[PDB]
Structure formats: C-alpha cells, structure tokens
Design a protein around this nucleic acid. Sequence first.
DNA 1: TGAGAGCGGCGGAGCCAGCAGGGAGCTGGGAGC
DNA 2: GCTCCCAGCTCCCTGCTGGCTCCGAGTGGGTTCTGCCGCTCTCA
Lengths: 113, 62, 672, 116, 95, 98
Amino acid sequence: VGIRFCQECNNMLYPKEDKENRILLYACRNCDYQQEADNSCIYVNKITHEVDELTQIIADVSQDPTLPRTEDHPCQKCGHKEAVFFQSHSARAEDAMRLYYVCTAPHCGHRWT
Amino acid sequence: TQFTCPFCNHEKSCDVKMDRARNTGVISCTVCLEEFQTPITYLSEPVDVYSDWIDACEAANQ
Amino acid sequence: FIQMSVQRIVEDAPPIDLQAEAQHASPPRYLLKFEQIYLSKPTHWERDGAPSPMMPNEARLRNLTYSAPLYVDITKTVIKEGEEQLQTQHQKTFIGKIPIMLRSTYCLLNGLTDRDLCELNECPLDPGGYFIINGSEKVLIAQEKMATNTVYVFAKKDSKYAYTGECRSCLENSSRPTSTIWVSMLARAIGQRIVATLPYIKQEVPIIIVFRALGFVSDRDILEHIIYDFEDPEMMEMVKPSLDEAFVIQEQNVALNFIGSRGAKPGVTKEKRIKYAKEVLQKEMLPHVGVSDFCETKKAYFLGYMVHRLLLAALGRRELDDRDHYGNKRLDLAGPLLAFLFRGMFKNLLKEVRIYAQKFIDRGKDFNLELAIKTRIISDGLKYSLATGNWGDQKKAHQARAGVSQVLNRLTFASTLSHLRRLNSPIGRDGKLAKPRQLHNTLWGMVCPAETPEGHAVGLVKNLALMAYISVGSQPSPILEFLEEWSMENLEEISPAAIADATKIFVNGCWVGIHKDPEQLMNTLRKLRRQMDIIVSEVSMIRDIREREIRIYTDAGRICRPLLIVEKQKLLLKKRHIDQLKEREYNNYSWQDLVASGVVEYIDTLEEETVMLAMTPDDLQEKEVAYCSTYTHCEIHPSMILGVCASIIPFPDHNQSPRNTYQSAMGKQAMG
Amino acid sequence: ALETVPKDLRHLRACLLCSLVKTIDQFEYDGCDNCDAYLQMKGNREMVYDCTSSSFDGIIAMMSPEDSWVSKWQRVSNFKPGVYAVSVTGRLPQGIVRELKSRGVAYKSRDTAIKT
Amino acid sequence: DPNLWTVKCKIGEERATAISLMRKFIAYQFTDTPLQIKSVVAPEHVKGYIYVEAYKQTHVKQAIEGVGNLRLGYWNQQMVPIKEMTDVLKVVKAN
Amino acid sequence: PVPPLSVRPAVVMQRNQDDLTHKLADIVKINNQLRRNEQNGAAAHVIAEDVKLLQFHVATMVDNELPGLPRAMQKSGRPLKSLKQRLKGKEGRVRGNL
DNA sequence: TGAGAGCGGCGGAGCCAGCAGGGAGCTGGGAGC
DNA sequence: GCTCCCAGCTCCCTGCTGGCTCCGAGTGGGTTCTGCCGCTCTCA
Ligand SMILES: [Zn+2]
Ligand SMILES: [Zn+2]
Ligand SMILES: [Zn+2]
Ligand SMILES: [Zn+2]
C-alpha cells in the first residue's frame, strides 16, 4: 500500500494526477507539498481475505498455561521437540481446522502451520 | 427546521432552505421577512445555519 | 456500607450556600458543612423518651422497627456584609434512624455467646442477615447487573449499525448515575463510518470531530491514539472513511461549536455553545477515567482504545463479548443497594433544609437548624422502601423496580438459608428470549445448577453455590502506588511509538498505564496477593496473552470461590497443614491462616478463564498419558458446585437433572 | 424617589385625578405626588378621603411615562413614576371640581371600566 | 413598541411582586446592569402571572432573575398576541 | 355525560372516591373556572390555557395513556384507570366479565 | 387579635398513515416557412 | 400567420419511515396502602 504522511504539516497525502504529464503524485490538502508515486497502486481490496495468520501469531503465546503442547512436530529451524499448537479465531480463516504451531523454546520464535 | 426569530422574536417563524447546487444555507423569517445567507459544507444541518445567523447578528451588534 | 459508604456519601455532598433577595436593598453567604457521622446501637424511643436497648425479639413481638439512630455534626460559618465570620458547631445532630441488620457488627447480638442468646430467646443457629421492620423479617435479594468501566463490543441484528461499542461509566459511587457512552460503526454509496452517541447530545457525532474537540488538531496525532501500529494497512484503510468525513473541521473551536449546537438544551449563542460542549466533555463523557482540570490526554487515549477495540471486533481479530458470561456481571448486595438509595435520600433532605433556610432568611431573621432538618424523611423513607420492596422514591413507585427486600421465608431451615443466598436477574419476565434463561458455562462452582424456580422465572432467580464468596470492594490506591514503582509508565509520559509492543494495564477498568515486561509482574502481583502484603485477597488479576491487555479488578460484587494452588504438578497443601487444622480447637489455626500461608487462592470468573483446573489432585496430577502437564489450580471438592437445597440430595449424579431441580424447589416446602 | 410607591398593601387608595395609588398614610403625610399643588392634601385625613378613593381596579407599575403605550392608553404619560391603578371609580366633590376648573385644570374621570 | 410577556408568579402574591419589581428597577436604574424592561401590569383578576413590557425576552429573563416568586416563569415566558394587547388593559364591571 | 353511581361506586372503609369520580371533579372544577373566567375576565389568553387543560382532562377521562402526553396521576403518583382501560384487554369488562 | 378548624392548593413483530423522490404525459415558446 | 417539436408543470406511482396493539389457563397465600403543608378565617 504505502500510505504516507505530509513531511511538513504531518497529514495524509492524497493521490492526484498531474494531467500535463499524466503522472500520479501524492499531494497534501493543506500545503503545496507534493511527492512522486512509486506504487501505481492506490486502492487494493482482497475480497476473498486469504489472510496468512502467521503474521499475527505472537511468540509470547507460548507462555499460555491453557494451551496444548506436543513433541511430535519438531521445529524446522532449531529442531526443538517442544511446540505449542492452537487453531484460528477469525471466521475469515480459509481453513477451519488449520493448526498453528509456535516453538516452545525461548527466542527461536519460529511460527508455522 | 424551525427556530425562534432573533429579531422579531416569533417562535417557529424561521424556515431554512438548503441549496446544495450553490452550497448555501438560507434562513428566512416568516414574520419580519429577515433574510440571511451563509455557506454550508456537505456535512451541515439547520442548527448550524441558525448558529451562523445568530453569530452574524451578534457581530453586527458588536 | 455502614462503616465507610455512609460517611463518604455524607461528606461528598456539596455544602449549601444561600442568601436573601436584598428586599428594599436592591445580602450575605454561609456554608452549613456536614463533616462526621456517629452511629448508636438500637434504642426503643417509646412515647416518654428515656432510651433503652431494644432486643430483636421485642421488636418482633411489638411490631417495632429494629433500627439505630445516627447523628451528624454540622459547623455553620456565616459571614455578614461587615466582613466577619461567625462559626457555630452542633454535635450529635439527629438526622434519622437507619434500620440495622441482625447479627451485623452493629446489632445487639454481635459477639454474644450461645448461652447469652438463649437467655434473650434467640436461636444460636439463626444466621441473621435480615432486617426487622414493623416486626417482620425482610431479606434484600441480591440484584445482578452489567459491569461498569469496561468496553463491551456487541453486534445487534437488523439495525443501522453493524457493531456498537459501549462503556457504562461510573465514579467511586458518586452522585452521578451510569453515564453510558456508545461508539458505533455504521452498516455500509460509501460507508463503514464511525459515530459516537455521547450524553446530553441529540445527534451522533463522527469520532474525528470528537477527537478534534478534545484538543488534537493534527491528523497523525489523532491516528496515533487509535491505530497503535501504522504498519497495518487493513486498519488504516478501514478507518480512513470516517477520517475523510471530517475533512472540513480543522480547529478545536469549530468542533466545540459542532458539539454544543447538537445539545438537548435550547441552542442560541456562541460562547454558550462552547461552554456547554466543554462541560459535557469534562464531566458528562467518560467520568471514571478522571474528572479534573486536565484529563484531555487520558480521555483521548481511552476513546482511541474504544475505537481500536471496535475496529478489531469488526475485522474479526477479536470476538464479540458475551452478555451472559458471568465475568461481565456484578452483584449488588445490601451494601450497594442501601448506598444507592441513601445517596438520593440524603440529597432530598439537604434540599428541604435549603428551602426552609431560604424561606426564613428572605425576611433576614435567623434560621434554626434543629427545625430545619426533618428527621422523618430519611427514617420513614428507608422503612417504606424495605417494607414494600419498591426500590426508589415513594412518589415514583411505578418507575421503581420492585421485588427487592422480600419477606424472609420461614417454613424450614433450608428454606431460610436458601432465601438468604439468592440472585435475581433484573430482566423482564414472560419474555420470549430464552438465551438469558439458559445455564451458562461460567456458572461453574459459583451458582448452583440444580436450584431455580420452575415457574415463569426459570433461569432468572438463581441460588448461590456453597463456597461462593462475593467481593466487598476496596480502594485501588495501594495497587496504583505499587504498580508505578515496578517500571510502569503512565499515559502522560509515554509516546505512542512504544504503545504497540508493550502490554496495557487496566485497574478497575480505567487504562492506568503501560509496561514493557508482562510476565514477571504477574508473578510479583501473585506473590503479593498470596502474602496479603499490599494486595488484599479479593483483588483479581487477569493477564490476556493473545491480546496484550492485562487487567486488575478491585470492584465490589465480583463473585469468586476458593481453589487450591498447584506448583509444578504438586499441591501446596501438605500433611502439616492438615495436622494443624485437625487440632484447630487448641491452636486457633483457622481458615484465614491457611489463606495467609499461600496455599489457597480466591478466583473469580475473569481469572478462571485463564486458569488450568484439576478435578482431583491424586487422580489428575500423576505420570500417565499426558493430557496437560501445566495444571495451575486444583479443586477442593466437586460437590461444592451445588447449592444449599441441592446439597441434601443423596446420589444426585444418579438422577435425571430435572428431578434434581424439582427436589431443590420441593425442599423449601418440607415441614420440620 | 420611593415616596411615589406603597410600603404595604393595607389601606391603599387611588387618587381620583391621576390614578396614583398610595397608602392613606402616605397621602396624609406627603400628599399626592401629582396633585398636591392643586389639592393641598398634605396633613388632612378628611381631604385625603375626599380626593382619594380606596376602591379601584388593577395595579400598573409605571417607569417611562414618555416611553410607554400604556401611559397613552391610561392618559398618565405626564405623571410621575409610581403604582397606577387601571381604573379608579369615584368622583370628586363638586366644589373641588369647580375650583380646578377655575384654576384651569379639567377633570376627567379615571373610571375607564366598561359598565354593563 | 416593546413586547408584552406573561411571567409566571405565585398565586395571591403577584401584587407584592410587581411592587418589588418596580422597587428593584429604581434601585438598579443607577447601576451598570439596570433593568431594561419597561413596565409591569397586574390586572385585578389575573392569577399566577404578571404582564411585563420589554423588547426582548432576554431582558425579561434577566430582569426577573433573582426573584423567588418568578422562579417558575424564569425559564419560559409567553408572547402576548398583538391583537390581544387592548385586552391587557380592558376593565369590565349594578346588582 | 357523567355515569351513575353504580359505574363509579365509592368504598366505605379502607369514603374513598373512585378513580373516575376524581377525574369528574377535575372536569367540573375547571369547567366552572373557565365559565366564570370567560364570563367576566374574557382575557383571550387564559381562555386558551383553560381550554387546553379542559380538553386534556376530557381526553384523559376515556383514554389515560396517549403518545407524547403526560398521564394523569392520582395522589401517590399511580395513574388513573380510564374508561378505555376499564374495558380494554384480558381483565376487562368484555373479555374478563362477559 | 391567638387556638380551632375548614379547606386550598401543590421488548419485540407486524400492519397502517404520512412524506419524498422519480418518471410519463400534456401545453406554451421558439423552429421553420 | 400556420403546424409543429422541446422544455416546464401535473399526475400517479413506488418506495420508505414512523406509530399502535398483542403477548396460555386456572389456583392459593401474604404484605403494604389509601397525601400532606399550611394558610387564612372563626370562636374566644
Ligand atoms: Zn502538508
Ligand atoms: Zn525452534
Ligand atoms: Zn423574525
Ligand atoms: Zn394623585
């Protein structure tokens, strides 16, 4: 996306066309500050919402006493046996019975599915 | 849409007309025929126009 | 109630100042300050005077009211136009008589021995806990309600709103009632704009106008309070619609006019509008976070958090709050109920005294405070509300909720015991919504599952578990002093740059601060509570891990139960504890010592969500096929999940559950 | 000048010539604020009874005799600020009326109440 | 011409209130905040209110401010109809 | 029309008059006031207020509950049982007594 | 004019009425002669 | 001066939002409660 604030007055830049050059520019509503765009993309919408939950998974969740932990699935990074596993919360998840594993050992923080 | 007139003090004697083409809100009294025009934004309500008219009347009286 | 709450209600009432009309002259001021209460033991006051102590049995026989007179001291300092102050004090001024609860710390039967009670024609087995009024027993049925100062996000069906976030806010039992505030997201031309329904405003206001009115004029500054991680494009693209709706108001004063114009009061002149809106934001919106000369930054942070919570719920990151989950419930017992009633009743007495004093000083002659106060208004008012059951002023008896303070059931001892332990949901009966009536999972160990009336009030009137204990509440000041020693920074000092990685600390619902290390702080707080040093046993501390909130609650009305503590798959209870307890008559080693030893803990529903329980230590904490290796607590005995009437059924696990309910109802009618 | 308003509601009378409403004691002591130069009502209770009548309809507070429409309606726009009744019923003695006419003061009845 | 308004007053006390109003006017006519109302009319058979003559209802509200008898009429005052003006002063009365 | 005593009987011991009799008293009392007031005073302003209160009392005799209007309340605040309330619904004259 | 006392007054669902916005269709002002 | 085509006014239609009424049948007990302040006139 690349949503970028005005350098001078700290406000959202709005996309705009420079018709003489047909060039996308980000311009403040309040000062004349302008910038050249680097993504031609303005509005992007993932309707299917195929969201990768591994971005939102936090390693600190490994400190949860109520979560189940197993050794059958070892870590691919450090090979540690212990790993805590849990499912998704959101209805938007593409797989209902998707299981997410977080490495139990401190500071590996490897997260996979 | 109605308000008490500030000049001829007649309740519900003020009517407000919204002209979005020219972006103006006009309030007219039906008794003393007092006319006031003030620009409006897309988010505007008759209470805003009444507020604008009362501020202008107070400013005119200093 | 009678120890702390009456005193704070009397003292926090504002002093009354009133002058004359300057008759012929067109006139002076005075203060009338109340300062300290003095409560007596119950006394007869028969026709002659000459007080003697009234025994509860005498009150029953002679249809008296077992009440105790209270006295307050008043200093009235009057200045006259000559610039001189005259300060007259009155001690032991008779305000009224409060009905007193039997076997309470102020009853005549407190601390008496069994032989003494038999001398007074009293039953030692009688548990007390009820009032005597006109010689009839009254029991204040506990009334449940939704918790306060906590953000709840719901999603109503078939309304113009997709999601609504509400926070019913209250101060420390101040005069103001619950000042609810709603933050709602519209249900999608272009959409998903966010509006606020704030008190004393006719129309909903977009959130960015409120933020502009609160003192934040820039755009990055406003966004910092709502989106804590600017690297999340989903939140940015979801909030920009409501942001572009506010493209036209770039200063505080215009937004202040915007709020003041939408007032329910008649809306006429600029500065009037400005002052009205500022007052609404200063006192009417969000009181629990602070009502002082400067709380704009703290208020803005809490409002931004509510919007952030709404966005998370609408994005599916979090789940909508459940209205039946007992963590969101609070129980008003005799204390809070009487306090709520007494607050308004004392205000009425002050108003009548003010009216009398004003009438006398209009002529400019002296007023007499002895005749100014009407001792009848408090005493007869309390007697009425506890004798009929209508909780409120008599003049509005239809508006007031009824059913509180029912006649104590005295058919069998089990009936008497059950009636004294009863919770009532203040929802309309004969309703077609069966969700509130269902047995929820969170009733485990706190509300008897078997015992409910089988008539039209199924699932609404519910009895209390045997080991359930309702918190009485305490001041959060010591916890606050402790917290900011342990590397905890208030909002006024932190920058929003580091607000994303750290955990947010809530105390009694108000966002107090932030801390960088969530784990070893919960350990420290747990140690303090197990040592009772600085944190009393009632305080409940809940760490949410997936969502970085960590919450601490000290309110009254939270229900909890005792549980055995486990350390590394081993109980903390040992043979020595049982040995000391078994000889308890000689060593006075009581349950309190067991709590102080760090062996048992009081857990409420919120903390029970984040705990790992064990049904029986020997049978569930052993080397076997591992199910869980991280048990945190253990249960003293499962049979404690039942109530009083359901704890007389032999082999209740060999019966169909409706039969248990019928026996619970029918045990109250067995003659004995 | 508070001398043109009553101090109490007992024994109030209205001047039959200018509708001024004062206590009979005020009429006895300081006379009529608008007719004493033509009546000499000071210090004469009997003359006060003759010229002022206890019986009247209404009370009007008058502040701006030159800036009041009620002053024009009541024909009291040339009188001193005071408490003025709406209608004063009665008539002066014939001798006093002839004396006023000889001086040049026309006597107009203040009883503006509609009869039947 | 200034407008007439009906100000709510205590029953049976309206007469003393009008006199008190006029007294206060005279006292305040020499101050920085004088009573800007014009006149007060108390007909014989009008109960519970007093007629007051002022150009603005704000003047009425400020002038009656501080009067105990007019506390009910402090918040709201009623515009007397113009055609009814002649009936404020109309008095009617053998048997 | 004012109904007979059978429609609005008065109890002997706790005479406490029927909820309808008190409304009748308000009606007749304000009627006399308006009658006398327009007979002599004829002030053209209090007539409007008198008419409004009389029309409110008449309406609330038959239908006590209205949208956007105050309910007539007996002393101790309990609203009066109007004729419509007497006759309407499950415990009424038709469905509960016929 | 003071005691006695008379009363004067101070939740939810689902049908009906109004309002607002939007076209087809008819009539005067200009287009050609 | 003639017929005729294009915009301005008339009509009906559709759609939408606010307002009123209903919510099982019987039965048995008990409890509280039926306004209050005072203000002016009369007998003494
Ligand atoms: Zn800029
Ligand atoms: Zn690993
Ligand atoms: Zn006007
Ligand atoms: Zn005179």
